[PDB]
């Protein structure tokens, strides 16, 4: 069997997410929402221009701002006017509102879906034996990009099917067995 | 080069077999025969450029999956699209534009000098950059300032306090931040 | 490509000798035979880059004994070590470092443009230089001033009167020579 877009809500209190299908042969993908906080962006020289995020699968901008000391917000820019998210790749200052001066540095905070990597963002492990055996995606690596708390993680993977067969005896006494559908 | 040959059969006399063996022996031993021309090819190929600096058309070389511009250590020219450059951990402090990366070889494959050039017709967006790379370490990107047509660059339509690149500019029509009464 | 040949023994007849001559004649006269492929190699080799710009591994080219950087007039990339550079009669007026020399060809082998790059991760030591060379004559080395991360460089831990390169710097923590009460 192939399981695809298998959905589990990730918990910060418990990094380990179970795969539903017990007898996993192998995993094909893992993906989830990641937040990047305080990504330093440098303002391009073209007025009303674009500025490029370090990830191309971004879908929501949380905040755009400048600071005179750590955590003190000097200006926050107001999305819709000021700037917008263009193509999921760029902050776009073509709206009629304010923008940072050219060449200055400002902060962006944004959400993107990551293709998680085995041995880098997550590791895979098992606990039980038999039908109570389970596969887990643990997100154990500390430098690994963990999903946002209380968001969907998707898994795609393959698992062994069972089969159930019927035993018959005919009038000649020959035992015959008919295979079921896997 | 080409051999003249006719297939011999059990009905052909020994003279015919002799004639074809002579045709073979002559084509293989004449002036500038196949052996001589192949020895000339081996000799001249050894003097040639055995590794690619462009592709086979004279366009930029391709590159694999990279996390950073420092992951490109093979010599030659690489076009990098604005969308790919954006995603790199060690991109320069600038707007995302299409660029070309030129990689200069050294004494070892673990070290390089990198040059980067932006691909814009706007004189405020055309830039040249360079750095040294050694394993995972590098210098910062060294920005080089060009005078457009040997003149100071002109800035307008911004607050003067929002200018942040070093150097000498003519400022006019500024939206704010100027001294009292100073228009340009 | 390869000939299928069997050595003719004392047991063999003129039919077997005929078969081996046919095997030779066929391998030499088939479509895309050895003669055609060697003529294709001569044609394609003539279009190729017949002189080296790198070594055969994609590293810098080797150079013979030299007295001056102007003695390297072949095109390509050359690594030069700090101890060697310190002895050359036309070296730039700088700290001795490992460098790469890039040589750009002209209308004759007696003239070149040379670019020189220093091989340091330290932003104060990474430098780009260039010059024109004609026979034994040249311009001086034209030093190109880079801005690290598009910013003025920082100087510290020295006397302000020992700074000897032109340009604009941020100075702090100087060991002496400052005005009274000026720390940076």
Automatic annotation (TrEMBL), chain A:
For this entry, the protein name equals Uncharacterized protein
Q: Which residues of the full protein are shown?
A: 244 to 425 of 1152
Native source organism of the sequence: Staphylococcus phage 812
- Highest taxon of the source? Viruses
UniProtKB/TrEMBL annotation, chains B, C:
**Record key words, sorted:** Receptor
Question: Know the name of this protein?
Answer: Receptor binding protein
Q: Which organism is it from?
A: Staphylococcus phage 812
Q: Which stretch of the intact protein is present?
A: 1 to 184 of 458
């Amino acid at each position: 069997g192939t399981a695809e877009n298998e959905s589990t809500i990730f918990n910060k209190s418990n990094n380990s997410i179970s795969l539903a299908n017990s007898p996993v042969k192998e995993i094909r993908r893992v993906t989830g929402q990641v937040l990047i906080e305080k990504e330093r962006v440098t303002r391009g020289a073209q007025g009303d221009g674009q500025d490029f995020l370090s990830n191309n699968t971004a879908f929501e901008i949380v905040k755009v701002w400048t600071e005179t000391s750590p955590g003190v917000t000097t200006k926050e820019y107001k999305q819709g006017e000021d700037f917008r998210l263009t193509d999921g790749q760029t902050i776009d200052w073509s709206p009629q509102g304010q923008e940072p001066s050219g060449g200055t540095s400002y902060y962006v905070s944004y959400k993107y879906n990551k293709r998680m990597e085995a041995g880098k963002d997550y590791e895979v492990t098992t606990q039980g034996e038999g039908l109570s055996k389970k596969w887990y995606i643990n997100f154990t690596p500390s430098n690994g990009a963990k999903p946002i708390d209380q968001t969907v993680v998707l898994v795609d993977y393959t698992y062994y099917l069972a089969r159930k067969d019927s035993v018959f005896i005919n009038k000649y006494g020959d035992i015959a067995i008919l295979p079921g559908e896997p | 080069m080409a051999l003249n040959f006719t297939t011999i059969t059990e009905n052909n006399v020994i003279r015919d077999l002799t004639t074809q063996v002579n045709n073979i022996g002559e084509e293989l031993t004449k002036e500038r025969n196949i052996f001589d021309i192949t020895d000339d090819l081996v000799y001249n190929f050894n003097k040639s450029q055995k590794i690619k600096l462009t592709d086979d058309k004279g366009l930029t070389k391709s590159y694999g999956n990279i996390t950073a511009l420092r992951d490109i250590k093979e010599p030659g020219y690489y076009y990098i699209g604005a969308r790919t450059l954006a995603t790199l951990l060690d991109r320069p402090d600038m707007e995302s534009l299409d660029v070309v990366l030129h990689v200069v070889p050294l004494d070892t494959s673990s070290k390089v000098v990198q040059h980067l050039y932006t691909l814009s017709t706007n004189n405020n967006q055309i830039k040249m950059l360079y750095r040294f790379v050694s394993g995972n370490s590098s210098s910062e990107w060294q920005f080089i300032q060009g005078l457009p047509s040997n003149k100071n660059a002109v800035i307008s339509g911004t607050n003067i306090l929002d200018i942040a690149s070093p150097g000498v500019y003519f400022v006019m029509g500024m939206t704010g931040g100027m001294p009292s009464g100073v228009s340009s």
